[PDB]
Design a protein around this motif. Structure first.
Motif, PDB file in Angstrom:
ATOM      1  N   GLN A 208      61.171  72.349 -37.729  1.00 14.33           N
ATOM      2  CA  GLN A 208      60.607  72.975 -38.922  1.00 14.33           C
ATOM      3  C   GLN A 208      59.386  73.826 -38.610  1.00 14.33           C
ATOM      4  O   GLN A 208      59.184  74.261 -37.476  1.00 14.33           O
ATOM      5  N   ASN A 209      58.578  74.055 -39.638  1.00 19.71           N
ATOM      6  CA  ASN A 209      57.405  74.912 -39.547  1.00 19.71           C
ATOM      7  C   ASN A 209      56.394  74.406 -40.579  1.00 19.71           C
ATOM      8  O   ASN A 209      56.417  73.228 -40.949  1.00 19.71           O
ATOM      9  N   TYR A 210      55.460  75.277 -40.986  1.00 20.39           N
ATOM     10  CA  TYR A 210      54.435  75.104 -42.022  1.00 20.39           C
ATOM     11  C   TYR A 210      54.918  74.403 -43.295  1.00 20.39           C
ATOM     12  O   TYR A 210      56.058  74.619 -43.723  1.00 20.39           O
ATOM     13  N   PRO A 211      54.094  73.558 -43.919  1.00 21.30           N
ATOM     14  CA  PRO A 211      54.563  72.766 -45.065  1.00 21.30           C
ATOM     15  C   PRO A 211      54.684  73.582 -46.341  1.00 21.30           C
ATOM     16  O   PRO A 211      54.102  74.654 -46.483  1.00 21.30           O
ATOM     17  N   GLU A 212      55.469  73.047 -47.281  1.00 25.22           N
ATOM     18  CA  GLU A 212      55.739  73.782 -48.513  1.00 25.22           C
ATOM     19  C   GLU A 212      55.553  72.990 -49.803  1.00 25.22           C
ATOM     20  O   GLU A 212      55.241  73.581 -50.842  1.00 25.22           O
ATOM     21  N   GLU A 213      55.737  71.676 -49.773  1.00 27.51           N
ATOM     22  CA  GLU A 213      55.817  70.901 -51.005  1.00 27.51           C
ATOM     23  C   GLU A 213      54.736  69.829 -51.037  1.00 27.51           C
ATOM     24  O   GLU A 213      54.052  69.578 -50.045  1.00 27.51           O
ATOM     25  N   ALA A 214      54.614  69.172 -52.194  1.00 25.57           N
ATOM     26  CA  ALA A 214      53.438  68.352 -52.481  1.00 25.57           C
ATOM     27  C   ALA A 214      53.459  67.034 -51.715  1.00 25.57           C
ATOM     28  O   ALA A 214      52.568  66.769 -50.900  1.00 25.57           O
ATOM     29  N   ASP A 215      54.458  66.187 -51.991  1.00 24.90           N
ATOM     30  CA  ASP A 215      54.735  64.921 -51.297  1.00 24.90           C
ATOM     31  C   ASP A 215      53.553  63.943 -51.373  1.00 24.90           C
ATOM     32  O   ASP A 215      52.882  63.646 -50.385  1.00 24.90           O
ATOM     33  N   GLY A 216      53.301  63.471 -52.595  1.00 26.51           N
ATOM     34  CA  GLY A 216      52.501  62.271 -52.814  1.00 26.51           C
ATOM     35  C   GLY A 216      51.026  62.372 -52.449  1.00 26.51           C
ATOM     36  O   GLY A 216      50.466  63.458 -52.265  1.00 26.51           O
ATOM     37  N   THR A 217      50.408  61.198 -52.325  1.00 25.03           N
ATOM     38  CA  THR A 217      48.977  61.048 -52.069  1.00 25.03           C
ATOM     39  C   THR A 217      48.700  59.601 -51.674  1.00 25.03           C
ATOM     40  O   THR A 217      49.614  58.777 -51.574  1.00 25.03           O
ATOM     41  N   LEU A 218      47.419  59.301 -51.446  1.00 23.15           N
ATOM     42  CA  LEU A 218      46.936  57.925 -51.285  1.00 23.15           C
ATOM     43  C   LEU A 218      45.661  57.788 -52.118  1.00 23.15           C
ATOM     44  O   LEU A 218      44.554  57.978 -51.609  1.00 23.15           O
ATOM     45  N   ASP A 219      45.826  57.451 -53.395  1.00 22.87           N
ATOM     46  CA  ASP A 219      44.696  57.295 -54.314  1.00 22.87           C
ATOM     47  C   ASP A 219      44.310  55.824 -54.458  1.00 22.87           C
ATOM     48  O   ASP A 219      44.263  55.272 -55.557  1.00 22.87           O
ATOM     49  N   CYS A 220      44.019  55.184 -53.327  1.00 22.33           N
ATOM     50  CA  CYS A 220      43.623  53.779 -53.322  1.00 22.33           C
ATOM     51  C   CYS A 220      42.112  53.618 -53.204  1.00 22.33           C
ATOM     52  O   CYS A 220      41.476  53.000 -54.063  1.00 22.33           O
ATOM     53  N   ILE A 221      41.524  54.176 -52.155  1.00 21.71           N
ATOM     54  CA  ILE A 221      40.101  54.011 -51.886  1.00 21.71           C
ATOM     55  C   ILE A 221      39.327  54.968 -52.780  1.00 21.71           C
ATOM     56  O   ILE A 221      39.659  56.155 -52.867  1.00 21.71           O
ATOM     57  N   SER A 222      38.304  54.455 -53.457  1.00 20.89           N
ATOM     58  CA  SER A 222      37.469  55.291 -54.306  1.00 20.89           C
ATOM     59  C   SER A 222      36.457  56.071 -53.474  1.00 20.89           C
ATOM     60  O   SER A 222      35.863  55.535 -52.531  1.00 20.89           O
TER      61      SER A 222
ATOM     62  N   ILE B  20      40.937  66.484 -48.804  1.00 19.36           N
ATOM     63  CA  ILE B  20      40.135  65.619 -49.662  1.00 19.36           C
ATOM     64  C   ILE B  20      39.531  66.457 -50.779  1.00 19.36           C
ATOM     65  O   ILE B  20      38.793  67.413 -50.519  1.00 19.36           O
ATOM     66  N   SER B  21      39.838  66.098 -52.023  1.00 22.38           N
ATOM     67  CA  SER B  21      39.222  66.724 -53.197  1.00 22.38           C
ATOM     68  C   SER B  21      38.962  65.611 -54.211  1.00 22.38           C
ATOM     69  O   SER B  21      39.853  65.260 -54.993  1.00 22.38           O
ATOM     70  N   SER B  22      37.733  65.080 -54.180  1.00 19.75           N
ATOM     71  CA  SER B  22      37.274  63.962 -55.011  1.00 19.75           C
ATOM     72  C   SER B  22      38.169  62.729 -54.836  1.00 19.75           C
ATOM     73  O   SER B  22      38.824  62.259 -55.768  1.00 19.75           O
ATOM     74  N   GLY B  23      38.195  62.224 -53.603  1.00 23.60           N
ATOM     75  CA  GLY B  23      38.899  60.996 -53.284  1.00 23.60           C
ATOM     76  C   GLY B  23      40.369  61.152 -52.949  1.00 23.60           C
ATOM     77  O   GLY B  23      40.903  60.406 -52.124  1.00 23.60           O
ATOM     78  N   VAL B  24      41.033  62.116 -53.578  1.00 22.76           N
ATOM     79  CA  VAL B  24      42.475  62.279 -53.440  1.00 22.76           C
ATOM     80  C   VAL B  24      42.782  62.921 -52.096  1.00 22.76           C
ATOM     81  O   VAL B  24      42.208  63.957 -51.744  1.00 22.76           O
TER      82      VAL B  24
END
Ligand code: SAH
Ligand code: ZN
Lengths: 176, 300, 352, 179, 107
Positions: free
Chosen positions: C1-15, C303-307
């Motif tokens: 593959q190459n450069y990314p295209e789609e969102a695919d989740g997050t880890l919004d656990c640690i504040s 990282i944009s405000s924890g996310v």
């Protein structure tokens, strides 16, 4: 001798000179509608354009066989493979003979006094092998099943190129 | 080459379930199907305690990275989590609608693979105890599961004879191993490079698989591999022996360069179904079925 | 593959996540939070590995080591401590002059780290004791000087507060190359941060007037001391005028990614040709803080405000793994299959 | 527990697709437009309109995931366009392997295979009470096997047609002989 | 004094740029037309024209034709959702309607 109008494989490249069959991709077998019933009918097959990578299985077949039957399917159809001369008859693969040259004048023949048989590989009068023996009686139209779209002609004259020497035959100016 | 018996550890009240060493290589505790898991030694048979507090039978039992925290594949649709140094029944894994036969850990030691008899391979946790994902692989019950060396690939051994290899990130099939016969696959495992899997199917013919291409390389002949989930092991302490269970009061141990009949241990009185090696020592574990109830540690 | 295209989740656990960095291998990601918490995840199975609540103070800078064991701390009381991935214990502790911005280890020895204050020249220390080597900078007027190692560990590229670059040696301070860039018309402006690749010697210039320039680590050595090179590739934006915050590279020096500071955006150029090829987006009103590229697979962590969002290619499932003999076609595929109608090499199984 | 050498350890099935779940004119394809205009949008609909899950008739059935209106196309039944005597060799071969025959014919000169190469259109059972039928069209000579509908069909119903052995349909006027 | 490469292929476009900048000067839209605004606008016009001509040519092939007559443009605009939401009040000459018979009329 002209070829057929309806008794033929339809999707093949039908040439306008009416003496040359040109094929397709795959084993769709044309049966020209002028073949033997009894006795003798000999004709030759002049070869114009035979490119490599071709399986020109030549021989005898009946109107009982499928149009999509490759020549060499059953006890009625015969087989003569290019690579390693192999016979495929009643689905039996046994490496029989050698290959064959390019640019000769081919042609097969059956000799049946009305039965005693000459079912023998015929090529410019040179034997490549005794093929088979003692068929039943019926209609045997000539069968052509090719792998490429090779330009190959047909002959019917009495003055042959390389006939079987001292041949008992009948001229094609009687029933064709 | 000169493996000799040191101690016979009998005492199981029912059929001996499985012998599994400690992953750090100091214990050999042995459990049984009597809902009782004992803590035995590996060098002299040093006994510690017996686990009590199950409801139905036991197929598989497991360990921790420090060889203290325990869990067992209980046959009441549960996986009760245990400990050596405290002994408290830690948790109990629900989420099954059928019996559970096998479970293992990733080498990071915080996930639980669950190939149970409900035929959908779930992915459980240790820290939270939570079912992450589901691999609906087979229409037949699971015989064994195994991670690869790092913890990135799961093999599927089942009755139908399809040794598929499954993704871990999003959980998808990558390849399906196929065969003309339909033997029940009993117990397979990976290689120390992840590119070889010895096949143990119920056809009296072992197989070793080229993983990256998909062909068989080297086999064996003259062995009884028919009835149960017959286990296979490795051996690099002596020669390149292949420790395997055996149904004819023997332990199938031969080399794979040789592929011959060179050494046959003997002494058991029932079908030997669970064997294991100590990772450094010349200790081969062996425990047969219900009519034997003994442990034979043949030491070189 | 190459450069990314789609969102695919997050880890919004640690504040309140604040910063992020990788190792060499691409399986270790520590996060200096808003209160001293240092959290590592997994990447293959994505579980939280180890929280290191080190300080009562927030953390502003971190760095991984070459062996995959050692870290380095930077709190708001100037504490630099040696950590471990096995124990996680404090080793070193002392107070700088009050500002500490970013640290960087030496690449081919875990003895030395390069530490940068705000209003002083960057200082290199060791990890054996509190020895520090004074580094001279050409201006010594505002002392807002940035510095970094190159890839292989040959020199130390420094950047002043006025727009002149010095090339020094790691121990003897050999000024061997220097250059001044023709910044626009009149004013030569400062440099924010210079980062370096993993394959070759390419690097980037991130000025304070919003223009990215591409250079090599051999052309400046060819030009010697006080030469005038040209940018290999100029990268800038005109429409939204686009201030920048964070710069890094692609996998094997193929592309260049650079997160923005206003619109929560990610841009992907090409170092080869020189044109923008994809724009990413996300939440419209957040504030982008830290961007890390993944070294052996196309993953970007932002990282944009924890996310922490992980753009991860959106894999597509199909057949042919279930039954590898059946080929799921698209249209009519007609053919005939057969024209002809019917050793003891000891390979190590333990080849680790 | 380790005392059951129990049977049902053979599958005889290359398709182990069956899982635990088994969940059962605004557009172009329902217009009066000419045929290739609908034939383009055929593939953009059929990749996500329907689904394949377990049925009580014979294993896996075809429960669609969209409320199909009457008169429009659904999906194409395509594969290896075989020629008429390889059929018998494959009959002998799949008699030797033990997998059933998946052969619909465009005409009585050329048949279409489905077992070796194809799509998800194989999961259509025969029934004597259908709600679909078949017409062959001419997309520039390269003819096709595309299935229309008959009546208004909702979400969660099996789609069948007449193929022209006792059948497992249970029709009101069933023929029970598929010849 | 040398050769002059145009502003139509310096950006890799097809619609002209000088003509668009002249039409923004000779119209009194505002005082001072900016730097690259005609380039941006010509790219937008290129994209819309390519988008509609794709569907036009596809329908022109599918009606066994080689030229294009405005019935194809009528079909290509009124089939899609987005262009139907844009071109609301437009009567294409020689256009024709879309086939729509109600549910209760036919037997
Ligand atoms: N009414 C019926 N009941 C059972 N089988 C049928 C049937 N009508 C046709 N068949 C046979 O069943 C096949 C349908 S394929 C059945 C679905 C799919 N193979 C599965 O996994 O379940 C056809 O090839 C046909 O030969
Ligand atoms: Zn029926």
């Amino acid at each position: 001798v002209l070829l057929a109008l309806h008794d033929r494989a339809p999707q093949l490249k039908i040439s306008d000179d009416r003496l040359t069959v040109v094929g397709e991709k795959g084993y769709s077998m044309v049966r020209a509608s002028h073949g033997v019933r009894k006795g003798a009918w000999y004709f030759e097959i002049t070869v114009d354009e035979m490119p490599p990578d071709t399986a020109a299985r030549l021989g005898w077949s009946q109107p009982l066989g499928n149009l999509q039957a490759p020549l060499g399917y059953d006890k009625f159809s015969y087989s003569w493979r290019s690579k390693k001369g192999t016979k495929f008859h009643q689905s039996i693969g046994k490496h029989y003979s050698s290959g064959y040259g390019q640019g000769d004048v081919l042609g097969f023949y059956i000799n049946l006094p009305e039965p005693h048989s000459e079912i023998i590989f015929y090529k410019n009068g040179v034997n490549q092998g005794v093929a088979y023996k003692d068929i039943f009686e019926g209609v045997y139209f000539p069968a052509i099943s090719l792998y490429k779209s090779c330009t190959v002609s047909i002959n019917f004259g009495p003055c042959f190129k390389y006939p079987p020497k001292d041949l008992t035959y009948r001229p094609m100016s009687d029933m064709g | 080459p000169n493996y000799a018996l040191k101690f016979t550890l009998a005492g199981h009240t029912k059929a001996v379930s499985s012998v599994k060493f400690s992953p750090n290589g100091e214990w050999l505790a042995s459990s049984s199907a009597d809902k009782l898991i004992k803590i035995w030694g590996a060098y002299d048979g040093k006994f510690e305690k017996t686990i009590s507090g199950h409801k139905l039978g036991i197929s598989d039992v497991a360990w921790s990275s420090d060889s203290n925290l325990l869990v067992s594949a209980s046959d009441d649709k549960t996986l009760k989590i245990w400990d050596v140094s405290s002994g408290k029944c830690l948790k109990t894994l629900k989420g099954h609608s059928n019996y559970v036969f096998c479970c293992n850990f990733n080498p990071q030691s915080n996930l639980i693979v669950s190939g149970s008899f409900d035929e959908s391979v779930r992915i459980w946790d240790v820290k939270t105890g939570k079912c992450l994902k589901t691999l609906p692989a087979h229409s037949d019950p699971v015989s064994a599961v195994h991670f690869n060396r790092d913890g990135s690939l799961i093999v599927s051994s089942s009755y139908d004879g399809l040794c598929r290899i499954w993704d871990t990130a999003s959980g998808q099939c990558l390849k399906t191993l196929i065969d003309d016969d339909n033997p029940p696959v009993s117990f397979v495992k990976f290689s120390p490079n992840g590119k070889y899997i010895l096949a143990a199917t119920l056809d009296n013919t072992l197989k070793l698989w080229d993983y990256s291409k998909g062909k068989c390389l080297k086999t064996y002949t003259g062995h009884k591999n028919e009835k149960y989930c017959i286990f296979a092991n490795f051996s690099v302490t002596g020669g390149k022996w292949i420790v395997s269970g055996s149904e004819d009061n023997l332990v199938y141990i031969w080399n794979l360069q040789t592929k011959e009949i060179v050494q046959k241990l003997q002494g058991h009185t029932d079908v030997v179904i669970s064997t294991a090696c100590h990772p450094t020592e010349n200790i081969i574990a062996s425990a047969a079925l219900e009519n034997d109830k003994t442990i034979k540690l043949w030491k070189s | 593959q190459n450069y990314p295209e789609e969102a695919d989740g997050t880890l919004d656990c640690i504040s309140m996540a604040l910063t992020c960095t990788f190792n060499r291998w691409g399986t270790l990601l520590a996060v200096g939070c808003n209160d001293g918490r240092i959290v590592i995840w997994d990447f293959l199975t994505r579980g939280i590995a180890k929280i290191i609540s080190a300080h009562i103070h927030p953390v502003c800078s971190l760095c991984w080591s070459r062996d995959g064991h050692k870290l380095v701390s930077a709190s708001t009381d100037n504490i630099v401590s040696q950590w471990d991935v096995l124990s996680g214990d404090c080793d070193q502790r002392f107070r700088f002059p009050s500002p500490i911005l970013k640290v960087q280890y030496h690449p081919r020895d875990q003895n030395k780290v390069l530490v940068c204050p705000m209003k002083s020249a960057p200082v290199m220390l060791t990890l054996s004791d509190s020895k520090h080597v004074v580094l001279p900078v050409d201006d010594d007027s505002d002392l807002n000087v940035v510095a970094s190692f190159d890839r292989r560990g040959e020199y130390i590229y420094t950047g002043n507060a006025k727009g002149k670059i010095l090339v020094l040696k790691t121990d003897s301070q050999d000024l061997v190359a220097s250059f001044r860039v023709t910044t626009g018309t009149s004013n030569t402006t400062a440099i924010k941060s210079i980062e370096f690749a993993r394959k070759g010697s390419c690097f980037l210039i991130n000025t304070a007037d919003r223009i990215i320039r591409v250079y090599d680590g051999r052309e400046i050595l060819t030009c010697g001391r006080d030469g005038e090179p040209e940018p290999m590739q100029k990268l800038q934006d005109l429409v939204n005028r686009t201030p920048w915050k964070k710069c890094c590279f692609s996998g094997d020096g193929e592309y260049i990614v650079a997160g923005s500071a206003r619109q929560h955006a990610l841009y992907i150029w090409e170092k080869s040709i020189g044109n923008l090829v994809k724009i990413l987006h996300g939440t419209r009103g957040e504030l982008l803080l830290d961007v890390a590229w993944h070294p052996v697979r196309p993953i970007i962590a932002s990282i944009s405000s924890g996310v922490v969002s992980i753009w991860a290619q959106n894999q597509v499932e199909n057949w042919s793994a279930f039954a590898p003999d059946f080929k799921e076609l698209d249209e009519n595929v007609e053919y005939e299959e057969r024209e002809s109608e019917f050793e003891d090499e000891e390979v190590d199984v333990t080849s680790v | 527990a380790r005392a059951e050498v129990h049977l049902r350890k053979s599958a005889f099935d290359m398709f182990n697709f069956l899982a635990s779940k088994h969940r059962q004119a605004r557009r172009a394809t329902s217009m009066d437009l000419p045929m290739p205009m609908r034939f383009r949008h055929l593939k953009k609909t059929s990749k996500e309109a329907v689904g394949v899950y377990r049925s009580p008739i014979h294993g896996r059935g075809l429960f669609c995931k969209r409320n199909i209106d009457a008169g429009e196309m659904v999906i194409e039944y395509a594969g290896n366009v075989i020629r008429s005597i390889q059929t018998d060799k494959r009959e002998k071969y799949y008699d030797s392997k033990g997998i059933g025959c998946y052969m619909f014919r465009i005409d009585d000169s050329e048949v279409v295979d489905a077992t070796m190469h194809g799509n998800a259109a194989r999961f259509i059972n025969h029934s004597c009470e259908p709600n679909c039928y078949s017409r062959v069209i001419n997309i520039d000579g390269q003819k096709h096997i595309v299935i229309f509908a008959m009546r208004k069909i909702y979400r969660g119903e099996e789609l069948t047609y007449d193929y022209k052995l006792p059948c497992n349909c249970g029709a009101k006027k069933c023929r029970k002989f598929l010849n | 004094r040398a050769k002059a490469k145009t502003r139509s292929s310096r950006a890799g476009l097809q619609f002209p740029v000088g003509r668009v900048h002249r039409l923004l000067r000779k119209g009194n839209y505002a005082e001072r037309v900016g730097a690259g605004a005609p380039v941006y606008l010509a790219a937008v016009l290129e994209y819309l024209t390519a988008e509609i001509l794709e569907l036009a040519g596809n329908a022109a092939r599918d009606n066994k034709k080689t030229r294009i007559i405005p019935r194809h443009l009528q079909l290509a605009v009124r089939n899609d959702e987005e262009l139907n939401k844009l071109l609301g009040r437009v009567t294409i000459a020689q256009g024709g309607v879309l086939p729509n018979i109600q549910s209760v009329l036919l037997p």
